[PDB]
């Protein structure tokens, strides 16, 4: 519901703060660190949501595990808190006693965010907690996150690479039907002040529940986004980011032809697209003549690719203009 969604927004901003901290703090910027940061972000989301809505933590699924393997081969279960000191102890057990980085990470983890949307605050929508499942993609496009290019110029507003392609994705779906219900996308690196080097981000949200469709305020023949490895048309890194390009209208269609996207790549974006009248369809099923669902597996890959669209009319146009070859 709207309350769950507001909490999801706040903790998406917390995840954005962690992702920014690991790149703007010298000690963390020195530092498998991508896997640690991803597992950390996902566990932060899960624990915050379970603490605010008890019983929800068991329904939060994600790309990452909650176990890590340190340098010695010990498998460490990632449980944080309740105090900052225990988180420091856990992290130092993962980081070979690196006390500076452990303390910095635990500082960003336990720091709390008060980041609200006044549009969402007036909305009073209630959804039974028992029907909700959650797919988290804690840091999408980890390659662009590690590369760290701050200086890329967009083509027609579409960044082909750069920190702008990194998203945090939180998607809520109906457990019984598989339909996506709510979505949060957090872009942690949208604009960088050249003089202070500090990054500002942007959040986007959407909700489609029993015929009610709301979404965040959007800023003001066919354009198509595809991935880098994919084998008018623009290349862009990031699954969440290309979906966002469709959401914002910078591209009308996003196609992915391989089987290497997953429910956590696409759930949140699908929910926002649904709240605007669009969706995501199975590509292969379209090409032999069907929305994506998120309760049943295969294992959690979107087999047969996907098409993401904001307008059904543009989808029909593109669909049968190409199946004519
Ligand atoms: Ca991913």
Numbering used by the authors: 1 to 31, 48 to 236, 262 to 272, 284 to 341, 350 to 358, 366 to 392
The authors write:
Enzymes within this family function in distinct pathways including inositide signaling, gluconeogenesis, and sulfur assimilation. Conserved secondary structural elements comprise juxtaposed metal binding pockets and define a shared sequence pattern of D54…E79E80…D153PID156S157T158…D317 as shown for INPP1.
Based on our crystallographic studies, we found that the lithium-sensitive, inhibitory metal binding site was coordinated by the carboxylates of two conserved residues, D54 and E80. Residue D54 was mutated to alanine, and we kinetically examined the effect of Li+ inhibition upon the wild-type and mutant enzymes. Mutant INPP1D54A exhibited a 4300-fold inactivation relative to the wild-type enzyme with a Vmax of 13.9 nmol/min/mg compared with 59.7 μmol/min/mg for the wild-type enzyme. While a large change was observed for Vmax values, the substrate affinity appeared to be relatively unaltered with Km values of 11 μM to 31 μM for the D54A mutant and wild-type enzymes. Although the D54A mutation does not significantly alter Km, there was a large effect on Ki. To rule out the possibility of unanticipated conformational changes, we first determined the structure of INPP1D54A in the presence of calcium. One calcium ion at metal site 1 is found in the INPP1D54A/Ca2+ structure, alongside two sulfate ions similar to those found in Gd3+ structures.
